[PDB]
Amino acid sequence: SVVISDAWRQRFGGTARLYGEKALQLFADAHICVVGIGGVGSWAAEALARTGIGAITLIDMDDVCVTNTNRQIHALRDNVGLAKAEVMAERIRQINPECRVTVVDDFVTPDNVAQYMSVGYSYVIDAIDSVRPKAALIAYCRRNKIPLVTTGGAGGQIDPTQIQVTDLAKTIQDPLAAKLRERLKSDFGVVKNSKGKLGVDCVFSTEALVYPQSDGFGAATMVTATFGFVAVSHALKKMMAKAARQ
Amino acid sequence: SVVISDAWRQRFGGTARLYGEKALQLFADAHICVVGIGGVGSWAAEALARTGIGAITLIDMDDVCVTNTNRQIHALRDNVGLAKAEVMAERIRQINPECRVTVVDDFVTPDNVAQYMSVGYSYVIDAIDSVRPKAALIAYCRRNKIPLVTTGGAGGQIDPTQIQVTDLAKTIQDPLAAKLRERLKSDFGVVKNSKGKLGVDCVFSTEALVYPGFGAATMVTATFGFVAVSHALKKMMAKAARQ
Numbered sequence: 001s002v003v004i005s006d007a008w009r010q011r012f013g014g015t016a017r018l019y020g021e022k023a024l025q026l027f028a029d030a031h032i033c034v035v036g037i038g039g040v041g042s043w044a045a046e047a048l049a050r051t052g053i054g055a056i057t058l059i060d061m062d063d064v065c066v067t068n069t070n071r072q073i074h075a076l077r078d079n080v081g082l083a084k085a086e087v088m089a090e091r092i093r094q095i096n097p098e099c100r101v102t103v104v105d106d107f108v109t110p111d112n113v114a115q116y117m118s119v120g121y122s123y124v125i126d127a128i129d130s131v132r133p134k135a136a137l138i139a140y141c142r143r144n145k146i147p148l149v150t151t152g153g154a155g156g157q158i159d160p161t162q163i164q165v166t167d168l169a170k171t172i173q174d175p176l177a178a179k180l181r182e183r184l185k186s187d188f189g190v191v192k193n194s195k196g197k198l199g200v201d202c203v204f205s206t207e208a209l210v211y212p213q214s215d216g217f218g219a220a221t222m223v224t225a226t227f228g229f230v231a232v233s234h235a236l237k238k239m240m241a242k243a244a245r246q
Numbered sequence: 247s248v249v250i251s252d253a254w255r256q257r258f259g260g261t262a263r264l265y266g267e268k269a270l271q272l273f274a275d276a277h278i279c280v281v282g283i284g285g286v287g288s289w290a291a292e293a294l295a296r297t298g299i300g301a302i303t304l305i306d307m308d309d310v311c312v313t314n315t316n317r318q319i320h321a322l323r324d325n326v327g328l329a330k331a332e333v334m335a336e337r338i339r340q341i342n343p344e345c346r347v348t349v350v351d352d353f354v355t356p357d358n359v360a361q362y363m364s365v366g367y368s369y370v371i372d373a374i375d376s377v378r379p380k381a382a383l384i385a386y387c388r389r390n391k392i393p394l395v396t397t398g399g400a401g402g403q404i405d406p407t408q409i410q411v412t413d414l415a416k417t418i419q420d421p422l423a424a425k426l427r428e429r430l431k432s433d434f435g436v437v438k439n440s441k442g443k444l445g446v447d448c449v450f451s452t453e454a455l456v457y458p459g460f461g462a463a464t465m466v467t468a469t470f471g472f473v474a475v476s477h478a479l480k481k482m483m484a485k486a487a488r489q
């Protein structure tokens with residue numbers, strides 16, 4: 001449990017006024033895991049910190065690169081070469097000194113996913129950009145009823161107003177989600193039920209993909225960050241709904 | 247014109263692969279003004295910097311407050327008490343050391359708007375949260391054909407997926423936009439044309455307001471800023487393509 005300080009109420013008074021006092025405590029007591037701290041995940045982590053989430057785990061083994069500058073909140077001249085997750089953790093500690101931040105300097109694999117998820121998270125935000133670990137994470141959380149929201153590919157898109165949430169089985173214009181569905185089926189026996197759903201919530205966009213315009217898909221902050229923000233809003237909404245139901 | 251360095255191409259290669267080389271050059275050559283560096287404007291400024299916009303002016307006179315923490319990108323423990331616009335300017339120089347960043351430590355008034363807009367901006371992003379200077383800024387840019395995107399109320403809302411852009415005359419569920427229309431009409435003679443349009447593009451949300459001095463969330467206020475920036479870039483690219 002987290003005791004909400006007077007400082008915490010100064011930082012997050014606007015949160016309490018928007019979501020309610022019960023939600024402020026719910027968020028303070030929550031532990032959310034963000035897997036992948038890149039074009040989508042770095043903004044998700046920022047949003048969690050700024051909405052009074054009391055414990056955040058960040059999982060990534062990558063370093064900050066100069067080419068991250070177009071789409072990642074931690075990508076600053078002075079951060080290049082440092083571990084992404086550690087850089088983001090330090091920022092979170094500046095946002096909320098009372099937030100409990102854990103860094104896992106690793107990638108999720110079929111072999112370690114149970115270990116890393118054994119912490120008992122309130123929610124998992126899957127912002128992984130490669131299919132093999134993404135499938136392992138999703139299959140595990142789905143099997144174990146761990147609340148999860150995943151994100152499709154956020155590159156090759158310029159319009160943030162077309163971003164929305166649907167079941168993973170129903171995404172369009174998203175090659176990553178399409179590969180992911182194939183891998184879930186072939187490697188984990190995850191297939192859609194009678195209603196044509198996989199039972200996995202996925203942030204995606206109706207926008208037709210914009211192919212590389214210069215000599216891999218490009219990306220923009222305005223879209224990749226909004227993927228991350230929509231994932232966070234979705235998660236908090238589901239957490240509040242569950243709490244109201246119990 | 248701006249000569250794009252090797253360093254610039256490394257930072258914004260992803261931008262070039264999304265929008266094209268001509269647009270990369272267009273952005274590098276652009277000068278965009280953000281008025282109000284708060285819950286909406288700070289994220290707009292961030293987005294401009296990370297999309298290779300070559301010159302950015304920031305206008306705000308307020309300081310970073312601890313109560314900004316829920317919704318403003320510059321609100322960090324070590325920044326509290328410093329001028330928002332200078333903090334954001336310093337951050338932009340960390341994003342792109344070659345960006346030409348100007349800080350105007352002031353608020354826009356009917357009396358100073360001409361001076362501050364005479365610079366010749368490629369686009370103005372209006373992220374002011376109070377009606378009187380907001381109307382004055384919009385009236386001036388509209389009269390002078392200065393490209394402008396304005397933002398409605400972003401507080402009291404939890405759903406980023408209902409944010410959109412339309413003409414200011416057609417917004418709904420937005421008390422700030424409604425007040426703004428009234429003040430524009432009464433004080434500046436700005437009224438709807440034959441097609442029912444004011445000729446002002448407005449970012450707003452269809453979401454019904456949530457009453458508790460509204461609360462706010464980063465996920466929504468930042469997305470207002472991002473949508474404003476994407477809208478401006480879309481219009482800039484279209485104009486360049488016409489010509």
Ligand SMILES: Nc1ncnc2c1ncn2[C@@H]1O[C@H](COP(=O)(O)O)[C@@H](O)[C@H]1O
Pocket residue numbers: 035036037038039040059060061062071084106107108109127128129130133134
């Ligand atoms: N298996 C994994 N576990 C954790 N993070 C990952 C994994 N695979 C990829 N990521 C991260 O996801 C991010 C993708 O960002 P982007 O380049 O914007 O697609 C990068 O920071 C990667 O290091």
Ligand SMILES: Nc1ncnc2c1ncn2[C@@H]1O[C@H](COP(=O)(O)O)[C@@H](O)[C@H]1O
Pocket residue numbers: 281282283284285286305306307308317330352353354355373374375376379380
């Ligand atoms: N007349 C004005 N000119 C420039 N900036 C302003 C003006 N009025 C308000 N602002 C700023 O707009 C921001 C609004 O942010 P928020 O508190 O999230 O609504 C604050 O940083 C204000 O200081």
Ligand SMILES: [K+]
Pocket residue numbers: 157172173174204205206207208209
């Ligand atoms: K899409």
Ligand SMILES: [K+]
Pocket residue numbers: 403418419420450451452453454455
């Ligand atoms: K609204």
Ligand code: NA
Pocket residue numbers: 160161162163406407408409
């Ligand atoms: Na939308």
